[PDB]
Amino acid sequence: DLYSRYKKLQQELEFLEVQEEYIKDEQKNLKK
Amino acid sequence: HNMSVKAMRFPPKSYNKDLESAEERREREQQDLEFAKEM
Amino acid sequence: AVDTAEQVYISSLALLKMLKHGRAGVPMEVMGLMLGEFVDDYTVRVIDVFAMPQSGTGVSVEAVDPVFQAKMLDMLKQTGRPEMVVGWYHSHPGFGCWLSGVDINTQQSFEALSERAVAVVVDPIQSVKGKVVIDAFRLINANMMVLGHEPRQTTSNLGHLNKPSIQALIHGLNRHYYSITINYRKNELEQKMLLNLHKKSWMEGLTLQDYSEHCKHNESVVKEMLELAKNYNKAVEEEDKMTPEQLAIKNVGKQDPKRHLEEHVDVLMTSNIVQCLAAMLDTVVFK
Amino acid sequence: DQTLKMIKILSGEMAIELHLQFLIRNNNTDLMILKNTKDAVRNSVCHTATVIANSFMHCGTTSDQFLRDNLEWLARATNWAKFTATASLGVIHKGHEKEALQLMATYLPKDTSPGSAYQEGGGLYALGLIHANHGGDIIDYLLNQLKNASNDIVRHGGSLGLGLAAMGTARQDVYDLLKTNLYQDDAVTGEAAGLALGLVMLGSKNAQAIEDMVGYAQETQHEKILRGLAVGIALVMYGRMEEADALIESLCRDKDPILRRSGMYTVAMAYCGSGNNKAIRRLLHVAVSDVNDDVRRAAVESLGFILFRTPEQCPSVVSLLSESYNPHVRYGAAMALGICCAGTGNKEAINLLEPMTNDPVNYVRQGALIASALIMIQQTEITCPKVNQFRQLYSKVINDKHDDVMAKFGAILAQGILDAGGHNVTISLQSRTGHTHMPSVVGVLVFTQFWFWFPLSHFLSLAYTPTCVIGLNKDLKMPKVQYKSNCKPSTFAYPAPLEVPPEPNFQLLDNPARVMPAQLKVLTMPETCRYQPFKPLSIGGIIILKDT
Amino acid sequence: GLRQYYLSKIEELQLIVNDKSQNLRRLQAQRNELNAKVRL
Ligand SMILES: [Zn+2]
């Protein structure tokens, strides 16, 4: 396939975006 | 100073397990504590 | 029967009563009475606690005067609002928490009155911030221990959540009494009015902090910070040498310049910048 | 006929009694296992654990010998284990109208009248278990007995079984005695009322009833009444994607930890299988900010429910949370794996669950064993080698004296989970169509909450789904097809108990034949038989097999 | 037009993958040392 090669590849940019904010929250929570 | 912070946090890697103490020594601590409680 | 899912609710005031009266006469086992609404078969909500004065000198639990609690029970009746006695307490001071043989007797005098009375132990030494340590108890029948039968018939994953202490396990622990998981009731009406009032400066940062001795104290840190930096010109040079674990055990007799240095850098930094900015706002604000 | 067609396809009995036919014909279980777990005789949870385990491994097969072996160790534990005993019978007789009243003819509440109103009270629970999603005489028969009865010692069983039979049906009739069941001002009616109050209104978003429920759960003092409704107001909204977010925002805005937890659930149900950015930001943030542990545990157990569509992503996010500072997040993390990847033998998820039994906390050792059971049902040594690596492990922990009853409780439960239905039933939160199986979703969601009620997670029968083809040519007539497979015949392995006191790949299969969903692609079509299927055999279930 | 249109989406996105993934790898170990300090 060629069409899924971009849809599923931006899909993990949406999915990937959350985790840096997540560990950004844990970075202060484990301090506190 | 801040660049000497940003380009030096690499080190923390490789090593990955910080064990609590053990499992079998926790069980033996439960047995010896059970014997002190029985005593 | 019970399901070891009893879940005592208490208060936000009675903890303060327990630590104050448990702390004032602390090496003697002080006691008093508990007073709240008795809700359903599972839970109980003890809203108030008043203490009882002692009988005489001696580390024990003395006795209870129903003249005194008859009157004190009626003072709040004709002044505040009626409640019900539900439990009682004493104070193992620096012991932890269990039931002594004296404790189980005066408990046994109270469970015959109401079958769901509550034994409570406060420990006002080993508590620091997150460890208050209370662990309210109640008797189990030794008759069923003679039967060899297991009481209390767990229907909920709520009981076996806190592991019991080894000292109470040495004591009557599971052969004469049981633990009860508790928690607390609070509200923002209280949370704000204790948060906003505990540590509050007033106009103090709008001052100048001993304006001659600020620079003098700044001198009074930098002067020994010089020789401490000379020790930092001493301690680096034994690297490319013996292993850093020996450079860890070996440094337990004499001070290091590193941590002691970065302490004073912080102290000079935050000591200066606050006096600078707070010095400069008043130039704008006052004329 | 076309006149009979509404009964054939809308009552749908010829999958009910025909999967029941597959259960009564196909039964591969063991006595020796419950002989091995028989040895743990003590008056702990163990009685309820065993008598819920045989119901777990004998769903709908009507096999009364693991109960009928004795009466003494059966009825030894009392006062709720007899309630669990009359609970466990309907799962054994699930999906069968006839042997419901006649076998419980001892167990009607007005026949023998013993001192146990639980043994005779919780029957209608099991009648609702048999006739879940089949509303008939179960409604009014299980309703007029609830018009006049005792207190909430039969009303739990009739209420839960009644709303279970009327699950997702929007019925004013059960809603009436659920109104007066709601306004009892009783603590013990809370699980009776708040559960079925949502069950009959599944996916209805009846905002007047929402206003009644959350308007009622703001003033009472008991907590079970604040908990059954905390499930029900989640249950009333289902798959909405935007249509609850003001209410989720309200419940999370409230100071009540139980109600914030209920919001967690509600956002867990309005986003089933949908990988939405809107849910995942706050949802994950609620398990990091909040101070109660319960809302953190439900907050991390929302993730497999919102992300079971792609099971490749939950091991990527939750393994980061297997090492939290609290065993609560370490616990709901493992149950988040156990709800996400349970359909597959995810080698990575088993790899995550390997050290999860090592932790010094008893309940995370427990839920490690529950998730370890859910990951590998109907999987024999060739999907993953860890199966018999863990079969010895459940025995290893159940035969210790020095463990906890809670610690071995996940093992004794995990037995009847692991060998359920004689390797003939399975979990499926998912049809092959892409549509999810919402009674299985309700069954696993309700199955989470065994913390606060033990036969609450007895509601698991709706998750047990077949892996079996059915060949058929008429409405009733069995054909006789014998097709085979092509691929490796060691995939077709069995439990094969040991009972201590040249390789054929042509697996000839009849019409009621079990087949792994991985084995749906490795089979052979019948090309030489007189019968040839007009449908392309990709799904199992039931098909037409055209006589050529 | 799918060559010069569609394939140009792939060469772009991967550059964001390669450094946001790397920032993630730095950041989660940066959690992990502190977490081991906490439980220890
Ligand atoms: Zn004492």
UniProtKB/Swiss-Prot annotation, chain A:
It comes from the Eukaryota. It is found in: Cytoplasm; Nucleus. Component of the 26S proteasome, a multiprotein complex involved in the ATP-dependent degradation of ubiquitinated proteins. This complex plays a key role in the maintenance of protein homeostasis by removing misfolded or damaged proteins, which could impair cellular functions, and by removing proteins whose functions are no longer required. Therefore, the proteasome participates in numerous cellular processes, including cell cycle progression, apoptosis, or DNA damage repair. Component of the 19S proteasome regulatory particle complex. The 26S proteasome consists of a 20S core particle (CP) and two 19S regulatory subunits (RP). The regulatory particle is made of a lid composed of 9 subunits, a base containing 6 ATPases including PSMC4 and few additional components. Interacts with NR1I3. Interacts with PAAF1. Interacts with TRIM5. Interacts with ZFAND1. Belongs to the AAA ATPase family. This is 26S proteasome regulatory subunit 6B. It comes from Homo sapiens. The gene is PSMC4. The chain holds residues 39 to 70 of 418 of the full protein.
Swiss-Prot record, chain C:
The modification Phosphothreonine is found at T243. Residues 8-143 form the MPN domain. Widely expressed. Highest levels in heart and skeletal muscle. It holds the Pfam family RPN11_C. GO terms for biological process: double-strand break repair via homologous recombination; double-strand break repair via nonhomologous end joining; proteasome-mediated ubiquitin-dependent protein catabolic process; protein deubiquitination; protein K63-linked deubiquitination; regulation of proteasomal protein catabolic process; response to ethanol; ubiquitin-dependent protein catabolic process. The keyword Thylakoid does not apply. Signal peptide: none annotated. Keywords: DNA damage, DNA repair, Hydrolase, Metal-binding, Metalloprotease, Phosphoprotein, Protease, Proteasome, Ubl conjugation pathway, Zinc. A motif (JAMM motif) lies at residues 90-103. Its EC number is 3.4.19.-. The modification Phosphoserine is found at S127, S201. One of its GO terms (molecular function) is proteasome binding. GO terms for cellular component: cytosol; cytosolic proteasome complex; extracellular region; ficolin-1-rich granule lumen; nucleoplasm; nucleus; proteasome accessory complex; proteasome complex. SMART domains: JAB_MPN. Zn(2+) binds at H90, H92, D103. Belongs to the peptidase M67A family. PSMD14 subfamily. This is 26S proteasome non-ATPase regulatory subunit 14.
Curated annotation (Swiss-Prot), chain D:
The keyword Repressor does not apply. The modification N6-acetyllysine is found at K401. The keyword Flavoprotein does not apply. PC repeats lie at residues 84-117, 122-155, 157-191, 192-226, 228-261, 262-297, 298-330, 332-366, 367-407, 410-442. GO terms for cellular component: azurophil granule lumen; cytosol; extracellular region; membrane; nucleoplasm; nucleus; proteasome accessory complex; proteasome complex. It comes from the Eukaryota. Keywords: Acetylation, Phosphoprotein, Proteasome, Repeat. One of its GO terms (molecular function) is enzyme regulator activity. One of its GO terms (biological process) is proteasome-mediated ubiquitin-dependent protein catabolic process. Component of the 19S proteasome regulatory particle complex. The 26S proteasome consists of a 20S core particle (CP) and two 19S regulatory subunits (RP). The regulatory particle is made of a lid composed of 9 subunits, a base containing 6 ATPases and few additional components including PSMD1. Interacts with ADRM1. Interacts with ZFAND1. Belongs to the proteasome subunit S1 family. Component of the 26S proteasome, a multiprotein complex involved in the ATP-dependent degradation of ubiquitinated proteins. This complex plays a key role in the maintenance of protein homeostasis by removing misfolded or damaged proteins, which could impair cellular functions, and by removing proteins whose functions are no longer required. Therefore, the proteasome participates in numerous cellular processes, including cell cycle progression, apoptosis, or DNA damage repair.
UniProtKB/Swiss-Prot annotation, chain E:
Component of the 26S proteasome, a multiprotein complex involved in the ATP-dependent degradation of ubiquitinated proteins. This complex plays a key role in the maintenance of protein homeostasis by removing misfolded or damaged proteins, which could impair cellular functions, and by removing proteins whose functions are no longer required. Therefore, the proteasome participates in numerous cellular processes, including cell cycle progression, apoptosis, or DNA damage repair. It is found in: Cytoplasm; Nucleus. It comes from the Eukaryota. This is 26S proteasome regulatory subunit 8. The chain holds residues 19 to 58 of 406 of the full protein. The lineage of its organism: Eukaryota, Metazoa, Chordata, Craniata, Vertebrata. Component of the 19S proteasome regulatory particle complex. The 26S proteasome consists of a 20S core particle (CP) and two 19S regulatory subunits (RP). The regulatory particle is made of a lid composed of 9 subunits, a base containing 6 ATPases including PSMC5 and few additional components. Component of a complex with USP49 and RUVBL1. Interacts with PRPF19. Interacts with TRIM5. Interacts with NDC80. Interacts with PAAF1. Interacts, in vitro, with the thyroid hormone receptor (in a thyroid hormone T3-dependent manner) and with retinoid X receptor (RXR). Interacts with ERCC6. Belongs to the AAA ATPase family.
